[PDB]
Design a protein around this ligand. Structure first.
Ligand SMILES: N[C@@H]1[C@@H](O)[C@H](O[C@@H]2O[C@H](CO)[C@@H](O)[C@H](O)[C@H]2N)[C@@H](CO)O[C@H]1O
Length: 857
């Protein structure tokens, strides 16, 4: 690792060699050039200690079975050393280390000199700008961090609450870049752009602000100059030695701006800011950044619910809680792939309960137009001052400055990313008056002007007041019809802002299960859902799958084997997830106590998991994935579980007309028991609704029966198809036996008729085209080819290689389809050609009642 004396440079350290402090008797030696590093582990940038060890193949894959449990934890109760060499070609310019992402705290050493202590460098989110000119010399230099162990209850850091299992190193390390910075007498820092757009959206007057710091021994004059959005800006100011000033540039108008819009509402353009700070007529430093022209409000409506709007357009928030990799392994591509999945799912937002991702994540979200909901996390140090019996230690005087500094640093990162619609200063508990003032003050200081939400629960903060959100559960199984209830003010019904709720277990696809659990573990899974699974939660509330398994047995029938359990798990996850979203969609436009947002719990998992996920750790797509995708289609037909209303949802930003909504009922022997065609439907923009018909109570329906919704646009084209499997027996709730994380059932619906649905057939043809942009698009055509009256039900197509393994990540236009005899559908799958790994592409088609076939592609 080198540096160029050219003033402006901000090169990240590309790697380190790491080792336990157990191996080091003389702290000061580690940073002296030529210190012997034999037996040290080389790790890439942004590594936890444990991620660093795995990179070196020192332990088995923790995604598989109980591998993570065989890792001795004790070795991570002492500090570890992160160490690298640093070539300096010319110490003409000053040298800085600028960084964050240290868990939990660190000593910083340069060339035998301790330049900062763990007291000065403390907290994952705190930024640090260390002037190390005094210690740097020409040639080979050395920098070493003594990173201290991490405890999320004690440290203003990251913890994993109850999502998965505790990583053995408890995430200790450096999980962001350490930047080596070079500049002259004057350092440029904190350059940003306050932007205020008018309500006609055709003018913005922009305010550029940036700090300059004179780290030389004498007074200087410095000119700060460059462009913002195609406009010259320039300011000259004076500076004493060691002095820092905030330069505020004069206002700049931008007549007709390229407004930034969420996915599906317009472009995702960003403008540039580009400043050079100069001394004696020479660049001393320089900073390039981006920003979006976009307004965002989150106001409380008349029923007391939080309501987002972007560029004056109100939106129902539809998304899921986002989590990074359990050992915080970063990969830019993987981050874009995940955000791209949000758009495949048709969601508009992700929430980050702490674990706030590096800058690139937000760059991508900005470009994709995916909205982000960052904030602090519950259930550990962050709320330890205000959460009573909940895990997390009470604050001491020294916690407050770190807390505030953390807020300032994150606000400083987030402020100019248009995808950000708010920061959450609380999650389960809102902070007290002291801590909230610190948080609000840090925001003002950074010019963070985005909505501030006191909590994701219902608890209000002293100063910002009501949240307009709720966290009543559930997080484990409830019947689909639960989601439709507005009568229980203490429950997770579709009203207000559901900031974190799901129905628990989300069994991943077979291809995934086999990679994550041994045959014996999988055997136990279906036979005894009541037993602990290492790949659910470390929490006792969610250590097992009892609640899911009783429900799955009683509703769909007892399980014969693994395949039976799994295919039943997928229909239940498809059924539940769909209902959860479709209910919130419908109740959006309700006059009184409407639904304002829904954050599914969760969008993804930190590792290979059995719950709280839409996509799994390998990017694979199951029942719950398909269920949300269906529920969130842009032009969509649904059916209400509470009252049989056939509703139509238009998520797009244009009103739409000439819509025909064909709705049919069938028994399990294929006999049509009802039919409706509503023609000339007109549904307005951005999640407006129209009823097509309320299905009447029909007699002679089989115990288990189907519903077939079809929606076509005025040019023909089938735009939405939605198939329900229902029961003349109803799911009912024993509301009185409710606990915080679910509501128990008194009655169960009977969908076991599905066990006996007669065989059908499909009916498949596929071919592929590889683009010059290194993607492949595979086109499959499905047909119900049988001569009966039975549908080809829950047909699932997967791009696979010759090994029959799924090509991932992948994005379908539609999947898990149901076709009545003679009907046809054409599907599109897009994926990177390289993920095929030289193999020829194939498609694996599997139905509930059509068996499995794979056709070439
Ligand atoms: N200890 C619970 C707390 O976990 C819960 O809030 C959410 O719970 C999810 C499931 O436990 C969890 O994954 C998420 O991180 C939490 N924000 C609250 C409120 O429902 O109650 C506490 O008793």
């Amino acid at each position: 690792l080198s540096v160029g004396a050219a003033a402006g440079n901000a090169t990240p350290i590309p790697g380190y060699v790491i080792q336990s402090s157990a191996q080091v008797s003389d702290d000061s030696a580690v940073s002296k050039p030529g210190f012997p590093t034999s037996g040290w582990y080389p790790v890439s940038s942004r590594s936890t200690v444990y991620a660093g060890l795995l990179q070196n193949g020192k332990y088995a894959d923790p995604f598989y079975s109980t591998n993570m449990q065989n890792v001795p934890a004790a070795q991570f109760s002492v500090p570890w050393w992160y160490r690298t060499d640093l070539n300096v070609d010319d110490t003409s310019s000053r040298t800085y280390l600028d960084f964050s992402g240290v868990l939990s705290k660190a000593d910083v050493w340069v060339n035998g000199t301790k330049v900062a202590t763990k007291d000065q460098v403390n907290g994952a989110y705190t930024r640090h700008d260390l002037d190390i000119t005094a210690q740097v010399h020409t040639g080979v230099n050395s920098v070493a961090f003594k990173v201290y162990p991490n405890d999320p209850n004690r440290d203003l850091s990251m913890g994993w609450i109850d999502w998965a299992q505790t990583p053995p190193d408890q995430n200790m390390g450096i999980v962001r870049d350490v930047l080596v910075r070079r500049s002259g007498a004057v350092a440029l820092r904190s350059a940003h752009v306050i932007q205020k757009l008018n309500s006609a959206l055709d003018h913005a007057d922009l305010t550029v602000k940036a700090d300059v710091r004179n780290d030389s021994a004498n007074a200087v004059q410095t000119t700060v100059a460059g462009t913002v959005a195609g406009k010259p800006i320039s300011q000259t100011v004076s500076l004493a030695a060691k002095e820092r000033k905030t330069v505020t540039f004069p206002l700049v108008g931008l007549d007709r701006p390229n407004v930034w819009w969420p996915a599906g509402m317009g472009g995702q353009h960003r403008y540039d800011l580009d400043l050079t700070a100069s001394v004696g007529g020479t660049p001393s430093d320089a900073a390039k950044s981006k920003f979006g022209v976009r307004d965002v409000k989150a106001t409380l409506n008349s029923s007391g619910g939080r309501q987002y709007s972007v560029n004056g357009k109100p939106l129902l928030i539809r998304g899921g809680g986002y989590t990074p990799d359990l050992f915080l392994r970063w990969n830019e591509t993987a981050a874009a792939d995940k955000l791209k999945y949000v758009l495949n799912l048709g969601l508009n937002t992700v929430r980050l309960e702490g674990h706030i991702e590096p800058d690139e994540f937000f760059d991508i979200a900005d470009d994709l137009g995916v909205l982000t909901m960052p904030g602090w996390e519950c259930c550990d140090k962050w709320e330890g001052q205000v959460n009573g019996e909940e895990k997390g230690e009470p604050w001491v005087e020294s916690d407050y400055p770190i807390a505030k500094a953390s807020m300032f640093s994150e606000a400083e990162r987030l402020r100019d990313h248009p995808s950000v619609i708010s920061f959450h200063i609380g999650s389960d508990f809102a902070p007290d008056r002291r801590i909230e003032q610190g948080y609000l003050d840090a925001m003002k200081a950074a010019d963070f002007l985005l909505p501030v939400i006191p909590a994701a629960s219902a608890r209000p903060s002293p100063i910002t007041g009501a949240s307009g959100m709720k966290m009543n559960g559930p997080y484990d199984y409830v019947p689909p019809v639960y989601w439709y209830d507005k009568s229980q003010k203490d429950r997770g019904g579709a009203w207000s802002f559901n900031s974190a709720t799901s129905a628990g277990v989300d069994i991943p696809t077979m291809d995934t299960l086999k990679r994550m659990m041994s045959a014996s573990e999988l055997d136990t899974m279906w036979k005894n859902p009541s037993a602990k699974q290492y790949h659910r939660s470390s929490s006792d509330t969610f250590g097992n799958l009892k609640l899911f398994g009783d429900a799955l047995t009683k509703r769909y029938g007892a399980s014969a084997n693994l395949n039976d359990f799994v295919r039943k798990a997928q229909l239940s996850q498809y059924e539940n997830v769909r209902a959860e979203f479709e209910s919130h969609s419908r109740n959006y436009t309700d006059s009184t106590n409407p639904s304002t947002g829904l954050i599914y719990w969760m969008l993804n998992s930190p590792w290979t998991s059995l719950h709280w996920q839409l996509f799994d750790a390998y990017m694979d797509q199951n029942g719950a994935y398909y269920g949300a995708k269906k529920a969130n289609e842009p032009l969509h037909i649904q059916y209400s579980h509470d009252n049989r209303s056939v509703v139509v949802i238009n998520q797009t930003s244009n009103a739409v007309s000439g819509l025909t909504a064909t709705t049919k009922l069938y028994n399990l022997d294929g006999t049509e028991k009802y039919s409706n065609t509503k023609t000339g439907l007109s549904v307005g923009a951005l999640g407006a609704k129209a009823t097509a018909v309320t299905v009447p109570a029909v007699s002679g329906l089989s115990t288990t029966y189907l519903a077939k919704n079809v929606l076509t646009d005025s040019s023909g084209k089938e735009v939405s198809r939605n198939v329900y499997w229902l029961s003349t027996k109803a799911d009912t709730l024993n509301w009185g036996g409710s606990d915080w994380y679910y509501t128990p059932q008194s009655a169960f619906a009977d969908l076991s008729g599905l066990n006996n649905l007669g065989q059908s057939a499909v009916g498949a043809t596929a071919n592929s085209v590889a683009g010059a942009d290194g993607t492949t698009t595979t086109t499959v055509t499905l047909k119900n080819t049988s001569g009966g009256r039975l549908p080809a039900f829950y047909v699932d197509s997967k791009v696979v290689d010759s090994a029959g393994k799924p090509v991932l990540p992948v994005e379908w236009n539609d999947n898990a389809v149901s076709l009545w005899p003679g009907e046809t559908t054409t599907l599109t799958a897009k994926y990177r050609t390289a993920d095929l790994k030289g193999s020829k592409p194939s498609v694996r088609i599997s139905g509930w009642n059509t068996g499995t076939q794979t056709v070439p592609a």
